[PDB]
UniProtKB/TrEMBL annotation, chains A, B:
The keyword Signal applies. This is Twin-arginine translocation signal domain-containing protein. Cu(2+) 6 binds at residues 55, 207. The modification Cysteine sulfinic acid (-SO2H) is found at residue 50. Cu(2+) 11 binds at residue 316. Cu(2+) 7 binds at residue 90.
Amino acid sequence: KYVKVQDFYDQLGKYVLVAPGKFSGTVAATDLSTGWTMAWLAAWNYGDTCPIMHHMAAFPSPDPYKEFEFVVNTQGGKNLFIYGVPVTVEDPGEGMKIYRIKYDGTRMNLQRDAAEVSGLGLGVHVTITPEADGYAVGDGQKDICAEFDRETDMVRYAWAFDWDPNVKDLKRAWLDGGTMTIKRLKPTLPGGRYDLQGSKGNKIDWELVPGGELAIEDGKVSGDRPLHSVANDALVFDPRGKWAVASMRLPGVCVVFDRENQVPVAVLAGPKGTPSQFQLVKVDDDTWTVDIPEVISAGHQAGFSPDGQSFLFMNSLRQNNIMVWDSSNHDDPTTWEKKAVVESPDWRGAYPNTFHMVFTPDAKKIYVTMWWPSPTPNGIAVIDAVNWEVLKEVDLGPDMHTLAITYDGKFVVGTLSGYQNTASAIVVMETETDEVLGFLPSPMGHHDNVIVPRTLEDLRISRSTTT
Amino acid sequence: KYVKVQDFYDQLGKYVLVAPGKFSGTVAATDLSTGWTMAWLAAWNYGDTCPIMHHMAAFPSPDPYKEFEFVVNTQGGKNLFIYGVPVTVEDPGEGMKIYRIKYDGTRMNLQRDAAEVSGLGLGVHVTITPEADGYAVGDGQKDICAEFDRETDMVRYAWAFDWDPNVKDLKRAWLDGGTMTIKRLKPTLPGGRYDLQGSKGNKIDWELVPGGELAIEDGKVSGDRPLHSVANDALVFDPRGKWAVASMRLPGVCVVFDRENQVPVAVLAGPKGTPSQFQLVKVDDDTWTVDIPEVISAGHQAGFSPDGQSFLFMNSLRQNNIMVWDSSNHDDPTTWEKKAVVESPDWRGAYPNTFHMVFTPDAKKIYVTMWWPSPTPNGIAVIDAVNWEVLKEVDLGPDMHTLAITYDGKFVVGTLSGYQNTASAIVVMETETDEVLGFLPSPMGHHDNVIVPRTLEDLRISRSTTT
Ligand SMILES: [Cu+2]
Ligand SMILES: [Cu+2]
Ligand SMILES: [Cu+2]
Ligand SMILES: [Cu+2]
Ligand SMILES: [Cu+2]
Ligand SMILES: [Cu+2]
Ligand SMILES: [Cu+2]
Ligand SMILES: [Cu+2]
Ligand SMILES: [Cu+2]
Ligand SMILES: [Cu+2]
Ligand SMILES: [Cu+2]
Ligand SMILES: [Cu+2]
């Protein structure tokens, strides 16, 4: 007579979902085989006075139910004021913490703040290296990305990015083009430490919010140096090793870095109607520039296919599409050429934006969230990643963020986050016939989620290769 | 082929679950008809520096999906240090806030702190009056309970309780008996306000935790006046009106109050081996005493059946049972006589404790949580509330707290809370054949939960009549 929710979980397999909660100040692991929260952690318990829990990634574990480690970062200061919540803390903590947490099979344990260890505080995307020997973080207020060692939490390399606009007016600073500088960042304090915790290095006093990139042109984003912003977002990894790609939202480019030799090698041009690449110019052993005649569109989410054959960059607002490069030539990224653009006649307005992504293990399909401001339903576009065409779009609810996939490829698990004030949930979609199976409660404002990987192979479709 | 979790929710009906998160610092409403979190609120966003979100109760709403109001309180100070979390907060807030929150069909809105309005801060059970015209709060650190007006958030009446032990040694202070004073508590500040916000009035510097009543005897609970503690817990309401009952954990008694005439009328004696009642002695128009020769056992949870015919008090630790009075005589509580004791040969050790409860609408069954410290599975006892016998016990998981019931009587919805550091969930049990249907994720340390009532009749099986 009665339906058991246990029958629903039985089909999903033995997979652990982990997500941060943005304004909730919390992070939580969920057993998809039972519906239990396995453990949660509230950063306010550790004296965090602005625990905006932002991005996260989990290292592979041979058995996540026995133990797994993850990295979750924070934002602070005026980031607290930019969602609909009538917050009262006029002078919050500066955030940019990089927390190391271990689930030990019973509880979450706060290990340390890697920003205190390294001296480098960064507040946007967190990714695991394909070797699971380290992690990377980007930041779009200070325009810095870095790869960190997993054992020591020390910086392996850090890059700072700067914009020199052709026209010194916020309305024209990106549209009329300019020169981006790529600068090696070296430690300045004893013990190989940086002096870049909290708000140190901020060019703008809050993040460019989802869909909000062009507010900076209209003078709506306060800061020391907004004319010089590029809004770095992430450093994603080629699953084949060697390369990391830094995404720059405002100039609409991605920079390909040699991880081992610690140099940039290529600049990918995001907008449809631009060449495959812009020319990287070496100035000195620590300094490169790239000239961009005009920025046709901002961009945001970025990722590799799990076989490394495709590199994707999402153009936003001025164009809404997925730009696709042929990255098949692992030896030389300067050869990576545009091969496709995913477009839809249904992507008509400034919104929706092509947003977060996850590939199937075989790289034949990609799931991409479609983001709108309140109250238009957000949802998932199902994309044929062989012919680069939209198969299907499904309406789900408010403020959709990240997608993960069970490592058998069977279920996509996504987050909806209520713009930090309304309805939020986990969504489950089966990948065989792309039906939405329904929602699980999730009282959190997640801008990220992962399924805990078991193998290095699993990482190729987790928070390593894509945002 | 694939199971849709929407099929599970379809059977539950149009019911709204609400729960506070204790150490999570959050509160959340869940749509049981879809699995969505409807809205959540993080008290740190409103300058709360110790948001231990403790107890809560919701007022009836003709349509909870359009709007509902609820009350949720907080605990603070050294309460932060008594769970397994290795907390690091140098200057925790004092808590004892009484938040008024309104869900407006989109978001939760913080209305005000009733403790600031009234001047009276209380941190344990919150209950709605059976008229839905007010609410009550108890506190076991200050030993005060009060009924508040819904419109003004001002105190209607407040009672302070004090213990005078026969033996001035914490080991013997309750076992060897004493005299409890019941004192009318009057305001001291302009506008009829109390001076009892935050830690003001604390006799002990932290709560007696679930199953932890004994710690005070062993000198393990610091405070100004622990020898004078009674650990008031709740003020529950007779669904027929007129009477409110204050539960006292340490002396093992409940005090019946005349709400309108603002006087105590009866003292119910909890332990098996005590009479139905102890003698209430009037000292003056503001002061009553009751002599207790020996406290045989502490007690905790308390409640009326929905028809008001039965009153229940749970004896804990020294005895684990449910003491049941015949409360059928609404005109004169001094006539209420013991009529049953729910006992089990399995309840003969210190644990499990008979814990929180919910009745079926027809009062024929009661569901009672059975609490153990880690790692013994906690669960639900299903009780025949006509013959007062245990029908069934089911093992569920760690740290079980409250139960609510859908107002059609079909589904019991309970919370498990991981001792603030491990596994947590919502559990759903169908009441027809008492099968556990399974769990929903809940990344929260809930010591409470409600289903939003629609009618005054619904309140009879919500957070009004019982804890
Ligand atoms: Cu982000
Ligand atoms: Cu300038
Ligand atoms: Cu991003
Ligand atoms: Cu190669
Ligand atoms: Cu997102
Ligand atoms: Cu974000
Ligand atoms: Cu309680
Ligand atoms: Cu004394
Ligand atoms: Cu209680
Ligand atoms: Cu009567
Ligand atoms: Cu409880
Ligand atoms: Cu409690």
